[PDB]
């Protein structure tokens, strides 16, 4: 993928293939993401059917079609403002203890002889933490993951119709049946002027949408640090914070996102007409030579590091601070308890939008 990205950044930064437009450079990728007035996120019919949702004419529908992720202003802020401080520095600080204790416990279940860290650590951590933060109970652990997988899948394909399967129905039932136990943020959404469908969509987004991406950040970090033999230096120079950002830039959990033009727009040397879909390749922008010197090289102490892995503009990842914290703690604690790491087997998640691992089997030394 990266040799292709490179060639495109050089010859066709903004390329039209007759179906959609694709952007590969940092400059333009950032331009699209920030210019919400001309590059819309309204790709799931949220704005068009908002009215029939609010007045109740629409009763059965896909909740995830209606979240802030696929809304433009002013609806966007009306939604985001309700949870904009859900991961406040003060709240996160209080959670560090929970996250650390949790991480320590997950690490204790690992059999050093041979075990899958995606299963034992990368997958569990985010679920346990978001569950704690939102107040929604972890019961059937396999179902939680199933929901994590399906939601991430759908979010990567905005506008593509998919009927509510059994699993999704169980997800919806679960949320409906546990809203009462929800915390502050959840109560604010439940007691708002949003239609039921929206409340369900909003809760699903907060509770499940960030699990697979954070899991991938953790998995990708382990892989990179190991591939490039950086563990020793990271511990020694305390590059955790910087090295995790390099991991976000070098191996982004989300490879790209989507936008639609609302009007004729000039992007680079190209002119894009109205109603066109624009695939923004975050993964490619993150390696742009202009912005990141020696961009194809992993530099653990790279700084500053303005990667676009959390996006940019009004939709900048609401969960960025939490994802960063969980990743930092998982990596920090992992490096301390384990002396050496040997990767025995790996299996990648077959997906174009999400970049991570389904299995990461390793052999470790303690102390
Ligand atoms: C390392 C993991 C993560 C990555 C790389 C990631 C990436 C992103 C990106 C690129 C966007 C913007 C997409 C666009 O502009 O179309 C975004 C939006 C968002 N993310 Fe994440 N995310 C991560 C973790 C999380 C977590 C932990 C949560 C929540 C528990 C979360 C919640 C959200 C929400 C709600 C939005 C919508 C923001 C808005 O539309 O205003 N993310 N994320
Ligand atoms: C596809 C695209 C984005 C996401 C996401 C962003 N933040 C949390 N999940 C998940 C799947
Ligand atoms: Zn229950």
Q: What gap in Å lies between CA 200 and CA 67, rounded to an integer? A: 9
Resolution in A: 1.9
Method used for this model? X-ray
Q: How far is the CA of 269 from the centre of ligand 2 (A)?
A: 30
Q: Which of 65, 69, 148, 203 to mutate to test ligand 2, by most ligand atoms within 8 A of the CB atom? A: 69
Please check whether residue 189 is in contact with residue 105, taking contact to mean a CB–CB distance below 8 angstroms: no
Whether ligand 2 lies within 6 angstroms of the CB of 356 is answered as: no
User: Of the bound ligands, which one is closest to the alpha carbon of residue 205?
Assistant: 1
> For ligand 2, is residue 317 a contact (CB within 6 Å)?
yes
Q: Give the closest residue to 151 by CA, choosing from 167, 135, 137.
A: 167
Cα radius of gyration rounded to whole Å, the chain: 21
Which of 156, 317, 322, 325 maximizes ligand 1 atoms within 8 Å of its Cβ, making it the mutation to test the pocket? 317
Query: Does residue 311 have its Cβ closer than 6 Å to ligand 2?
Result: no
Query: Taking the mean position of all CA atoms in its chain, how far away is CA 133?
Result: 17
Cβ count near 74 (within 10 Å): 8
Q: Report in angstroms the alpha-carbon separations of 135 from 180, 207, 236, 301.
A: 9, 10, 38, 37
Ligand 2 atom with minimal separation from the 209 CA: 9
- Closest by alpha carbon to 352, among 224, 252, 215? 252
Nearest ligand 2 atom to alpha carbon 153: 11
96, 321 contact by CB (below 8 A):
no
CATH of span 1-367: 1.10.630.10
Q: Identify the three-state secondary structure at position 40.
A: strand
Give the ligand with the smallest distance to the CA of 204.
1
| Residue 363 backbone dihedrals phi, psi, to 5 degrees | -120, 135
Q: What is the DSSP string of 185-252?
A: HHHHHHTSSS-HHHHHHHHHHHHHTTHHHHHHHHHHHHHHHHHTT-HHHHHHHT-HHHHHHHHHHHS-
How many angstroms does the Cα of residue 275 sit away from the middle of ligand 1? 25
Tell me which DSSP letter residue 264 carries.
-
User: What is the torsional sign of CA 249, 251, 254, 260?
Assistant: positive
Sequential DSSP letters for 346-363: EEE---SSB--EEEEEEE
Task: Pick left, alpha or beta for residue 244 (phi over 0 → left; psi -120 to 50 → alpha; otherwise beta).
Answer: alpha
Helix (H, G, I), strand (E, B) or coil at 36: coil
Other Cβ atoms less than 10 A from the Cβ of 128: the count is 20
The answer to whether 334 and 235 have CB atoms below 8 angstroms apart is: no
Which residues contact residue 225 at a Cβ distance below 8 angstroms, ignoring those fewer than 6 apart? 231, 234, 243, 247, 331
Residue 70 DSSP class: G
Helix, strand or coil, per DSSP, at residue 334: helix
Tokens of 280: 């923004």
Atom of ligand 1 nearest to the CA of 70: 40
User: Among 96, 152, 196, which residue's Cα sits nearest to residue 144?
Assistant: 152
- Rounded Cα gap, residues 4 and 265, in angstroms: 26
Nearest in space to 71 (alpha carbons), one of 33, 45, 53, 51: 45
Residues with C-beta less than 6 Å from any ligand 1 atom: 33, 41, 68-69, 80, 130, 205-206, 209-210, 213-214, 217, 253-254, 257, 309-311, 315, 317-319, 322-323
For ligand 1, pick from 63, 212, 319, 327 the residue to mutate: most ligand atoms within 8 Å of CB.
319
- Write out the DSSP string of 114-172: SEEHIIIIITHHHHHHHHHHHTPPP--HHHHHHHHHHHHHHHTSTT------HHHHHHH
Structure-token match 């002119």, residue found: 271
Q: Which residue's CA is the closest to the ligand 1 atom numbered 39?
A: 315
Q: Where are the domains of the chain?
A: 1-367
């Amino acid at each position: 993928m990266y040799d292709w990205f490179s060639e495109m950044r050089k010859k066709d930064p903004v390329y039209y293939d007759g179906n959609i437009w694709q952007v590969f450079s940092y400059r333009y990728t950032k331009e699209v993401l920030n210019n919400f007035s001309k590059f819309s996120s309204d790709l799931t019919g949220y704005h068009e059917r908002l009215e029939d949702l609010r007045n109740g004419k629409i009763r059965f529908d896909i909740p995830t079609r209606y979240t802030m992720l696929t809304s433009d202003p002013p609806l966007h802020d009306e939604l985001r403002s309700m949870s904009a401080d859900i991961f406040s520095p003060q709240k996160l600080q209080t959670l560090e203890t929970f996250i650390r204790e949790t991480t320590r416990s997950l690490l204790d279940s690992i059999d050093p002889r041979e075990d899958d860290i995606v299963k034992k650590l990368a997958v569990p951590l985010p679920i346990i933490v978001i569950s704690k933060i939102l107040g929604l109970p972890i019961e059937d652990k396999e179902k939680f993951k199933e929901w994590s997988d399906l939601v991430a899948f759908r979010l990567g394909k905005p506008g593509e119709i998919f009927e509510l399967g059994k699993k999704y129905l169980e997800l919806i039932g679960y949320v409906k049946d546990h809203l009462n136990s929800g915390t502050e943020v959840v109560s604010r959404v439940v007691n708002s002027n949003l239609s039921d469908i929206e409340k369900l969509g909003y809760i699903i987004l907060l509770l499940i949408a960030g699990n697979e991406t954070t899991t991938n950040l953790i998995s990708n970090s382990v892989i990179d640090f190991t591939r490039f033999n950086l563990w020793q230096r990271i511990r020694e120079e305390n590059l955790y914070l910087k090295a995790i950002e390099e991991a976000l830039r070098y191996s982004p959990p989300v490879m790209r996102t989507v936008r639609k033009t609302k009007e004729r727009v000039k992007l680079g040397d190209q002119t894009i007409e109205e109603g066109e879909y624009v695939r923004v390749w975050i993964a490619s922008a993150n390696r742009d030579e202009e912005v990141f010197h020696d961009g194809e090289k992993f530099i653990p102490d790279r700084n500053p590091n303005p990667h676009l892995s959390f996006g940019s503009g009004i939709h900048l990842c609401l969960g960025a601070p939490l994802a960063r914290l969980e990743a930092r703690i998982a990596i920090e604690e992992f490096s301390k308890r384990f002396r050496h790491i040997e990767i025995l087997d790996t299996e990648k998640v077959p997906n174009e939008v999400l970049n991570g691992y389904k299995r990461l089997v390793v052999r470790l030394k303690s102390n």
